[PDB]
């Protein structure tokens, strides 16, 4: 099956990985 | 009793120890076809007699390690006893 | 009262192991 | 430092756990 | 099964657990594990044959 | 910038190391041509180029360019070695061909696999890349 | 046929000297004693825990008494920055007269040992000023340790002996220990700081006589009950506060400046007072959560066995099966002991990480050797607590674990995919080691060939950011509390960053260990640390998961935890047991903490001497570690005694050689194994029964060689003791010889 | 023996970077490595390393890179033999690189 | 002494009886296997823990197993 509960939290954590890099790349300030 | 001949060697420092007085002592008898040179598990070479032999050994491990060495002499008659210091001789090898 | 070092250190250096080892040796070798 | 008298009070008070440690270590068995 | 049938092993303590064997001979009455399976890879002892029960195997051919 | 990173072409410490260049190869100006290329890096307070593994496209030559060049090669070392072990499993000996290389089978495997990113996705999407967990030996739990 | 050991009839019927050695290493193992039942187990461990608790108070009382009677605490108050503390005094008869003159130091009459454990800084901070308070607190701990020695005796008597259900009442420990042991004690220490330690910090004596008369605040508990709590944060100790004097003093008792005191370079005592007060409220509220006999609160066994999230059926909490884990934690004692050592092992290193950067003791940032020893001490303590976490976790899987009670849950699903855990742990250990060792050897060859610019130097740009996302201007990243236009800098809806003007003063000064400046030399060592953590974990997890059997040897649970091998068969099985994977890991765990404390020590030898350029150039290649740290610093140490004389470092010069000898002795038990030595002792048994006068005497226990599992203990014991004593003699004297 | 021989005479072997004795500086450190590497074979046993390969053969069985010649750990006698050959190599080569760089400088 | 457990999977190979050097093992008749005999260990007070008997057994996994127990004088292998 398409693992909804697994990929739901992995994409949440990876969105935290991309948010902190936006501070480091000065995209968000 | 046991009533066997003692093989020809000049004595070893292996031999028997204080356990042979205190806890137990084993003894292996075999009837040899002829006189020839074999090895002692105590260490060194010896010379068996013709007819019934006897070797007072320290442990049961020695007599079955020796009996495998006697098997290549066409000697499959070896019988180990367990000689307790109270004089109690127990036939242990073989089971029958 | 720094003289108590002269009376506690040799007791713990000498008398304490002699009293302990001679008790334990006679206790482990006790049928 | 502390006085010479106060060291002996500390030694006599230290016999109270020294007695109780001998009672606990022998109530826990031999 | 029969002499030449690929089977699988479900005995957990065995070395070839969940591996493909080849039945070499099946006995008739005794032992309780009457199936000789000639494996293709060797265990740590170096051998590649063993005895297995009738219900122990999974036929894959 | 960067940080604690002035460019190497602006550092007096890097230009002091420029005046005492040691020649790498027997090329007599190999000590000098080394430092005209290191002038674009970022040398700190010591005069040594500090690399940037960030992903910045002005510092892509440090780690972004050699990572693509490595992963094409080292995956191809392991892709060829995977396709050869698939081939010799379906043979009569299967252990002679491991120590004593079947060179007539090995050389078609070596020359083929340079398009392994075009290959290794096709085994993935078809599921032939992996094996079933009901077909691999496992330890008693 | 003796009656020793009492706890085993199988050991007491051993004619050899194996009887003696296995009594020692099975004595405190209460679970393998003869006839030990379940409720008798807990009742004996609980009273034993009063025995170890009372050793701690008797230990801490000798720290107070040997300082009050033999140290120079009252002479250390006058000038803590140059007066060198004293631990205890030497009475050694074997001394020569130049070795009494060398240890007569720190202004003393006889030979004294300079204290490098920093307990003068902790006692001076918390208010103690004269030698009588040290003696009074010493005598109090004699009575307070005897109050636990009596308590352990009392709770072994038959109607005072607790039942089995009292021990397995886990929801009632969590309410009492969180609210009372954690929360009230944090509340009580906040009461000690505000009533005593903060007024002692202002030249104002508050003792047992006048603490009921004097108030900590001239407002005096009226702003507490009325809700005007901002009165407690009035005029603080200013930036000209000379410590323990009235100059620049304040009236505030709960303040929130953040950062450091300007003279002592420690945390403000008013900051610690609002800290342990706020910790106390968060824990008393946390201790009113679980269900006890009052019919209210959460129930952990119902939280595990829950299967329904607001009507939606799930597998458990986080849709993960946690059923049976309550009957797995609570029924087993090795699951608890293996767990809480991991909890205590995390915080022990976490203590050490936050005490060099955030000093909390007066004048401890300038007494260098006391600070270099406290980091390395609690790091090695954190090492054993983490190795024993996996060790006692793996005794659980052999002995206590039941797969039927634990069927289908999350701890069962780890044992299914355990070959995927060990494989990806084996990957990262090899992926780091092949490329971290590769870059040191690359930098070694490149510097050796006279062209050091060809080094592969990587700035740690992902930890450059965090130090600039905490407020360091020195790199110029300009984000997140270093960007003064940030939402995080201003706290946009409420603007309540009270801590932040005092935090940014501390982090932007180059005169402390707060967020040290990092460079390319620090890149390689943190990836060398990550090599050591993933590899030590590899050995411990694989020994935990394969503890119940595998392909080479199934049913390893039938042989217990520590057994030598299974013979030379199947290729041999040397070091196969789950104990043997404890054993291999403590070489790595001592190694990794070497790396984290060689790197700690040499970065601070540049800060303390003003030479930061020596570390940043030379810590990229492994000769600069070997030359500029190991070779160059051991010149003060090794000249502790030479044919010209001695000095005060001659113990540490002697202990350094002593450590090299205990370390090397432990190789003999590990390279050479047993069967060489049993064939050697059988020649000494011969030549004692033949010697004519000396065979009047004879052994009672037959001499046999040390067993296989035993001289891996004894081999690791000489290895670990020599590893500790060698570095601890190098850490002290290379720092206490240079200052 | 530690101060005036091992410490004092090694000041020519570790200070030899950027000069012609650089290889003896690299063989001094490089032989300290191989000596320390040998202890992995001497201290540990065979039966640990066979268990570890079983978890690496699994990840090699999963992606179908299973070798036909099965991996085994080194035998008990060989693990001792590897551990003494790497021991004697790194211990002598330490001294080889220490005697040369000291005596090619003061001679 | 030690403990010698013999499971029901062996085939009567007589390789374990011909390898135990203190002669602990012996064959008894047993109608199960093809060779119609199973190994038996009636003299386990003589066993020295050698594990020669586990090395010589063919069957996977081993039908014979030696559990190392309390070590008396006969199982330590002491001539003194
Ligand atoms: C465990 C704690 C501890 C330790 C390691 C030390 C260590 C030392 N003390 Mg000290 N001492 C302590 C507590 C301690 N003290 C306490 C609480 C008191 C107050 C009674 C004293 C009173 C004292 C005096 C008066 C003198 C010393 C001296 C000494 C030194 C020599 C050893 C000796 O003679 O012991 C002396 C021991 C005693 C007087 C009684 C011991 C008291 C403690 C409570 C017993 C602890 C036993 C321990 C817990 C048992 C566990 C053993 C362990 C291996 C499992 C040495 C520096 C001598 C010294 O300084 O020489 C230069 C000296 O003259 N000590
Ligand atoms: C056919 C080649 C091949 C392939 C595709 C793989 C693939 C894999 N190995 Mg493996 N391995 C191999 C050979 C191979 N291995 C050999 C020969 C050894 C013995 C040295 C190992 C030892 C090994 C260990 C110890 C580990 C892996 C791991 C892994 C996995 C992650 C990749 C990695 O860490 O590389 C690891 C690579 C090495 C350790 C060195 C590579 C070996 C040589 C240099 C390459 C082989 C090339 C081959 C001989 C060419 C033959 C060509 C043919 C036409 C003749 C992956 C499943 C890891 C794992 O389980 O992760 C999940 C892991 O921990 N392997
Ligand atoms: C924190 C330290 C600590 C504590 C609380 C205990 C506690 C205990 N041990 Mg133990 N032990 C320890 C450390 C400790 N041990 C260490 C380091 C070793 C060496 C390896 C041992 C070796 C050991 C053996 C060999 C035995 C015990 C036994 C015991 C029990 C009874 C003690 C006894 O008879 O006292 C003896 C009394 C005194 C020493 C008097 C001290 C008085 C002073 C003034 C008790 C549960 C015994 C037992 O039967 O357990 C059930 C037992 O056989 N232990
Ligand atoms: C409010 C009541 C209360 C209190 C105060 C305690 C207190 C305690 N119980 Mg307890 N208990 C209670 C109720 C209570 N219990 C109830 C109701 C039950 C039955 C359900 C139990 C059942 C029970 C058992 C079965 C056991 C205990 C044990 C203990 C002791 C824990 C070990 C210890 O001293 O750690 C002290 C820990 C702290 C003071 C907190 C440390 C916090 C972290 C680790 C460090 C933080 C410090 C910080 C960093 C600063 C330090 C720096 C400074 C030192 C310089 C401790 C004395 C154990 C014991 O040893 O028995 C004697 C034990 O075996 N209890
Ligand atoms: C558990 C810790 C603890 C304890 C035992 C005490 C005990 C005491 N405090 Mg104290 N206090 C504490 C924590 C504590 N305080 C904390 C955390 C603060 C900061 C909010 C204060 C702030 C405080 C003030 C401001 C005053 C007291 C006062 C008092 C005394 C009066 C008793 C009373 O009214 O109740 C008493 C000695 C009053 C007093 O008269 O002291 C003698 C007083 O004026 N305390
Ligand atoms: C508070 C923590 C704690 C507790 C309660 C226990 C409790 C226990 N552990 Mg555990 N353990 C711990 C921490 C703890 N451990 C840590 C931190 C580690 C990692 C190092 C381990 C590793 C470990 C292993 C590997 C094993 C245990 C075992 C045991 C059990 C029996 C202990 C025994 O036989 O003692 C006997 C005590 C000794 C043999 C002491 C000898 C070692 C001493 C300390 C050497 C000291 C050297 C010397 C004095 C230095 C002198 C210096 C001088 C020369 C200058 C018992 C349940 C054993 C077991 O079977 O569990 C059921 C077992 O196999 N534990
Ligand atoms: C320039 C010098 C240099 C050298 C000498 C090495 C040498 C080595 N590297 Mg390394 N590496 C380098 C630069 C270098 N690296 C750089 C610049 C990068 C960044 C891209 C990496 C990234 C890298 C990875 C990610 C891995 C290695 C591994 C290895 C070892 C085996 C490589 C191989 O081909 O095995 C033969 C190949 C196989 C047996 C199978 C192929 C496995 C390859 C390496 C992975 C590719 C698969 C896939 C496309 C990517 C996986 C995901 C990944 C992004 C995480 C070997 C010691 C491997 C290792 O440590 O294994 C233990 C490994 O996994 N290296
Ligand atoms: C110079 C010393 C040295 C070196 C380079 C290594 C290198 C290695 N050891 Mg090793 N080891 C050593 C000393 C050393 N060991 C010693 C003295 C012991 C104590 C017996 C061990 C115990 C040990 C174990 C138990 C393990 C390693 C592992 C590893 C590998 C980790 C991967 C890596 O970083 O590369 C690698 C082959 C691990 C490994 O191979 O992972 C797959 C592993 O499991 N080693
Ligand atoms: C030396 C050695 C022996 C022989 C050593 C023996 C039998 C003991 C030697 C020490 C004697 C008994 C004196 C002990 C004195 C200690 C220095 C301190 C003892 C005090 C504690 C026990 C409290 C082995 O039997 C052995 C077996 C397996 C692997 C390695 C070895 C091994 O290395
Ligand atoms: C590492 C180690 C192993 C495992 C080590 C092994 C299996 C040796 C593997 C090392 C070599 C380098 C692997 C070579 C594999 C291929 C033949 C080479 C592939 C690359 C080619 C181009 C050569 C043991 O089995 C062992 C046993 C007993 C005591 C200590 C140890 C021990 O330390
Ligand atoms: S235990 Fe082994 S040797 Fe004995 S009969 Fe069975 S298979 Fe043969
Ligand atoms: S213990 Fe093992 S090797 Fe020794 S006699 Fe018994 S079966 Fe044979």
Numbering used by the authors:
A (entry chain bX): 16 to 44
B (entry chain bD): 4 to 99
C (entry chain bI): 13 to 43
D (entry chain bM): 11 to 40
E (entry chain bE): 2 to 62
F (entry chain bF): 24 to 164
G (entry chain bB): 2 to 740
H (entry chain bA): 646 to 752
Sentences from the paper on this structure:
Photosystem I (PSI) is embedded in thylakoid membranes of photosynthetic organisms, converting light energy into chemical energy, and its oligomeric state varies among different organisms. The light energy conversion reactions are carried out by two multi-subunit pigment-protein complexes, photosystem I and photosystem II (PSI and PSII, respectively), embedded in the thylakoid membranes. Each monomer contains well-known nine membrane-spanning subunits (PsaA, PsaB, PsaF, PsaI, PsaJ, PsaK, PsaL, PsaM and PsaX) and three stromal subunits (PsaC, PsaD and PsaE). There are 95 chlorophylls (Chl) a, 22 β-carotenes, 3 [4Fe-4S] clusters, 2 phylloquinones and 5 lipid molecules in a PSI monomer.
Here we solved the structure of the PSI tetramer isolated from a cyanobacterium, Anabaena sp. PCC 7120 (hereafter “Anabaena”) by single particle cryo-EM analysis at 3.3 Å resolution, which reveals unique monomer-monomer interactions for the formation of the tetramer. The tetramer is organised in a dimer of dimers form with a C2 symmetry. Within a tetramer, the PSI monomers take two different, non-equivalent positions designated A and B, and their symmetrically related positions, A’ and B’, respectively. Thus, the neighbouring monomers have two different monomer interfaces, and we designate them here as Type 1 (between A-monomer and B-monomer) and Type 2 (between A-monomer and B′-monomer), respectively. The Type 1 interface refers to the interface between monomer A and monomer B within a dimer, and is formed by a number of interactions among the subunits PsaB (A), PsaL (A) and PsaL (B). The Type 2 interface refers to the interface between the two dimers within the PSI tetramer, and is formed between monomers A and B′. Compared with the Type 1 interface, the Type 2 interface has a smaller number of protein-protein and pigment-protein interactions between the monomers, suggesting their weaker association. On the other hand, when the Type 1 interface does not allow formation of a trimer, only dimer is formed by the Type 1 interface, and further interactions between the two dimers are possible through the Type 2 interface, resulting in the formation of a tetramer. These structural findings, together with the sequence alignment of PsaL, suggest that PsaL with bulky amino acid residues is a key regulator for the formation of the PSI tetramer in cyanobacteria. In the Type 2 dimer-dimer interface unique to the PSI tetramer, cluster (Site) 2 in the B′ (B)-monomer closely interacts with cluster (Site) 5 in the A (A′)-monomer, which may contribute to the enhanced quenching observed in the PSI tetramer.
